[PDB]
């Protein structure tokens, strides 16, 4: 198809976790959770990420146990039979803002805001695409294109017209530690947090990968040596043919 229906290819940014030895910036994961809680939690669900994965990564155990109390969850009904509600504990999932799909479509002019738990893993480009899509809203669409009303223009979205308005403005949140909150800083922090949500096994996976490729490379070289050793009796055999005497 044409390039407008393909979507503009997102560039190759220099992330802090692009590399065979680098890990996630966990301060960026903490700041990205603050950006997700204050900005993206009005539309987007995140329901494959429990509260217990959040400890030891971005917040501490007391902070996550204090953050889980602010939401109510379905508890099994009491002695009479009528249902009860309870404050959340560490085992429950992070709650979505909309109770079903139909309210999510009704509160966003028909467009369902997708679940963000696997959103940098289920897109072509990944974190580069998410960051450039967040920062890629122009102040005006180009001269000639016509959009349906209520639909905003974003060139990195495949199709040209996304139904999500530009939300990341300057000084929308103020951070807990003192980093300045621009649109690019907030965008980078929230997509590093989305990459942590899509792959929590990143650090452990790359460490076990370092172990496995060191062990298997040394094993490959030693097996090459022992193959040449066991085959040195065959690579240097010599054949001598004197012609036999006739009968």
């Amino acid at each position: 198809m044409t390039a407008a229906e393909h979507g503009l290819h997102a560039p190759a940014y220099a992330w802090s976790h692009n590399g065979p030895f680098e890990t996630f910036d966990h301060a960026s994961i903490r700041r990205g959770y603050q950006v997700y809680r204050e900005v993206c939690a009005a539309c987007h669900s995140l329901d494959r990420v429990a509260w217990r994965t959040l400890v030891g990564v971005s917040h501490t155990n007391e902070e996550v146990r204090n953050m889980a109390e602010e939401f109510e969850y379905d508890d099994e009904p009491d002695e009479q039979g009528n249902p009860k509600k309870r404050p959340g504990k560490l085992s429950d999932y992070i709650p979505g803002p909309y109770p079903n799909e139909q309210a999510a479509r009704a509160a966003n002019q028909g467009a369902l805001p997708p679940d963000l738990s696997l959103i940098v893993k289920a897109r072509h480009g990944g974190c580069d695409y998410i960051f450039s899509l967040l920062t890629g809203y122009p102040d005006e669409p180009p001269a000639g294109v016509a959009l349906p009303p209520g639909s905003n223009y974003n060139p990195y979205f495949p199709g040209g017209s996304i139904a999500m308005a530009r939300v990341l403005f300057d000084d929308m949140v103020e951070y807990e530690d003192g980093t300045p909150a621009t649109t690019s800083q907030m965008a980078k922090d929230v997509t590093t947090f989305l990459n942590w949500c899509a792959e929590p096994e990143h650090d452990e996976r790359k460490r076990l990968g370092l172990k496995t490729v060191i062990i298997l490379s040394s094993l490959y070289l030693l097996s090459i040596w022992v193959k040449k050793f066991k085959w040195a009796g065959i690579k240097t055999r010599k054949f001598v043919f004197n012609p036999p005497k006739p009968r």
């Binding site: 030895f21 890990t23 996630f24 910036d25 966990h26 971005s58 370092l210």
Partner: peptide, 13 residues
């Protein structure tokens, strides 16, 4: 692996 990333790990932050 935890000395190559100083400034980024959870214990340091």
């Amino acid at each position: 692996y935890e000395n190559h990333n100083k400034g980024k790990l959870w214990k340091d932050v």
